[PDB]
């Protein structure tokens, strides 16, 4: 309500595709959430603003990098013929919301390897025969000749230069993601810097800054859902999560050609447009620039998230049981700091 502004323009009036081919996507294809959003800026890679945003660790969409230019041709027939005979990780859900688990962390408290043509079949199958799948596989040597070529034509000049301009560490992985229309990756944060390169179809990316930690409520560090929000965005429990009513997001819709910089520790929620077809994305993950020699004050939001993560981990080791972390922390604050 009031101030009365319309800076809550969301991801905005949909783009017109070239050659009068109509609206890329439609508002009816968005899921409906409780909270307001402001647009990520869409910029030329040659726009000095865009270098400014990334320098400053703020999200930006670059519309013209040609990062994954040779992969625009990618689709299911072309991948099945060329991706090779490797094992691919394939996540399934009964619901539209995918929930992921750290498997080492389950001791404390569904994935399936298969070949591409099996993923395509299961997928081929469902369309003829409620079930949702999500292929998410980091890329390796098992990929065949044409994918290696495609890959070599990616814009290494551009991204190499960002790696160096920013002081980042090494490229740790590229992950291919192939999702079915309507698929949701719920809100979480990654601790690496991300260029999220869209290839086929449209994904709506809702981001929140690291200073909304208090509104988003991640699972304990030792839980298998570490780094994800406990909050169900389609049914927020305001009694448990009262500061979710103060959440403000940055949103955009990425299509083929676009690259979204997701800065390190930024929350994101990624959904594949309703009735949009399959989505394909490749991510580029880098380690951030080292922590400087001596600190500066004020601390950045992400540094205080780092600090909180490490109090929970240490307390896990000290007590000898991560289930005791919470009782000690409560005993520490109650009637003392709250
Ligand atoms: Fe992520």
Curated annotation (Swiss-Prot):
SMART domains: JmjC (SM00558). 2-oxoglutarate binds at residues 134, 185, 194, 203, 283. Coiled coil: none annotated. Fe cation binds at residues 188, 190, 268. Changing residue 333 to R: No effect on dimer formation and HIF1A Asn hydroxylation activity. Residues 1-116 are annotated as: Interaction with VHL. Its cofactor is Fe(2+). One of its GO terms (biological process) is regulation of vascular endothelial growth factor receptor signaling pathway. GO terms for molecular function: [protein]-asparagine 3-dioxygenase activity; ankyrin repeat binding; carboxylic acid binding; ferrous iron binding; NF-kappaB binding; Notch binding; oxygen sensor activity; peptidyl-aspartic acid 3-dioxygenase activity. Residues 131-301 form the JmjC domain. InterPro entries: Cupin_8 (IPR041667), FIH-1_dom_II (IPR027452), JmjC_dom (IPR003347), RmlC-like_jellyroll (IPR014710). Substrate binds at residues 141, 170-172, 190-192, 227-228, 289, 310. It catalyses: L-asparaginyl-[hypoxia-inducible factor alpha subunit] + 2-oxoglutarate + O2 = (3S)-3-hydroxy-L-asparaginyl-[hypoxia-inducible factor alpha subunit] + succinate + CO2; L-histidyl-[ankyrin-repeat domain protein] + 2-oxoglutarate + O2 = (3S)-3-hydroxy-L-histidyl-[ankyrin-repeat domain protein] + succinate + CO2; L-asparaginyl-[ankyrin-repeat domain protein] + 2-oxoglutarate + O2 = (3S)-3-hydroxy-L-asparaginyl-[ankyrin-repeat domain protein] + succinate + CO2; L-aspartyl-[ankyrin-repeat domain protein] + 2-oxoglutarate + O2 = (3S)-3-hydroxy-L-aspartyl-[ankyrin-repeat domain protein] + succinate + CO2. It is an enzyme of class 1 (oxidoreductase). Residues 1-8 have a biased composition (Low complexity). PROSITE patterns: JMJC. Its EC number is 1.14.11.30, 1.14.11.n4. It is found in: Nucleus; Cytoplasm; Cytoplasm, Perinuclear region. Hydroxylates HIF-1 alpha at 'Asn-803' in the C-terminal transactivation domain (CAD). Functions as an oxygen sensor and, under normoxic conditions, the hydroxylation prevents interaction of HIF-1 with transcriptional coactivators including Cbp/p300-interacting transactivator. Involved in transcriptional repression through interaction with HIF1A, VHL and histone deacetylases. Hydroxylates specific Asn residues within ankyrin repeat domains (ARD) of NFKB1, NFKBIA, NOTCH1, ASB4, PPP1R12A and several other ARD-containing proteins. This is Hypoxia-inducible factor 1-alpha inhibitor.
């Amino acid at each position: 309500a009031t101030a009365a502004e319309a800076v809550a323009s969301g991801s905005g009036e949909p783009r017109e595709e070239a050659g009068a081919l109509g609206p890329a996507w439609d508002e009816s294809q968005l899921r409906s959430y409780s909270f307001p959003t402001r647009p990520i800026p869409r910029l030329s890679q040659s726009d000095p603003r865009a270098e400014e945003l990334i320098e400053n660790e703020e999200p930006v969409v670059l519309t013209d990098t040609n990062l994954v230019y040779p992969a625009l041709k990618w689709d299911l027939e072309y991948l099945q013929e060329n991706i090779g005979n490797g094992d691919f990780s394939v996540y399934s859900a009964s619901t539209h919301k995918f929930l992921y688990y750290d498997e080492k962390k389950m001791a404390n408290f569904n994935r399936e390897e298969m070949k591409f043509h099996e993923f395509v079949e299961k997928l081929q199958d469902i369309q003829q025969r409620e079930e949702r799948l999500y292929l998410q596989q980091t890329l390796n040597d098992t990929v065949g000749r044409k994918i290696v070529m495609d890959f070599l034509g990616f814009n290494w000049n551009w991204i190499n230069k960002q790696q160096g301009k920013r002081g980042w560490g090494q490229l740790t992985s590229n992950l291919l993601l192939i999702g079915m229309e309507g698929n949701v990756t719920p809100a979480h944060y990654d601790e690496q810097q991300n260029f999220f390169a869209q290839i086929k179809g449209y994904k709506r990316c809702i981001l929140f800054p690291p200073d909304q930690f208090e509104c988003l409520y991640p699972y304990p560090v030792h839980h298998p859902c570490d780094r994800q929000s406990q909050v169900d965005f389609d049914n927020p429990d305001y009694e448990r999560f009262p500061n979710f009513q103060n959440v403000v997001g940055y949103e955009t819709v990425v299509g083929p050609g676009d690259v979204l910089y997701i800065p390190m520790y930024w929350w994101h929620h990624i959904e594949s447009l309703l009735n949009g077809g399959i989505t394909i994305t490749v991510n580029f993950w880098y380690k951030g620039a080292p922590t400087p020699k001596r600190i500066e004050y004020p601390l950045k939001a992400h540094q205080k998230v780092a600090i909180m993560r490490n109090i929970e981990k240490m307390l896990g080791e000290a007590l000898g049981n991560p289930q005791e972390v919470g009782p000690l922390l409560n005993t520490m604050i109650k009637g003392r700091y709250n």
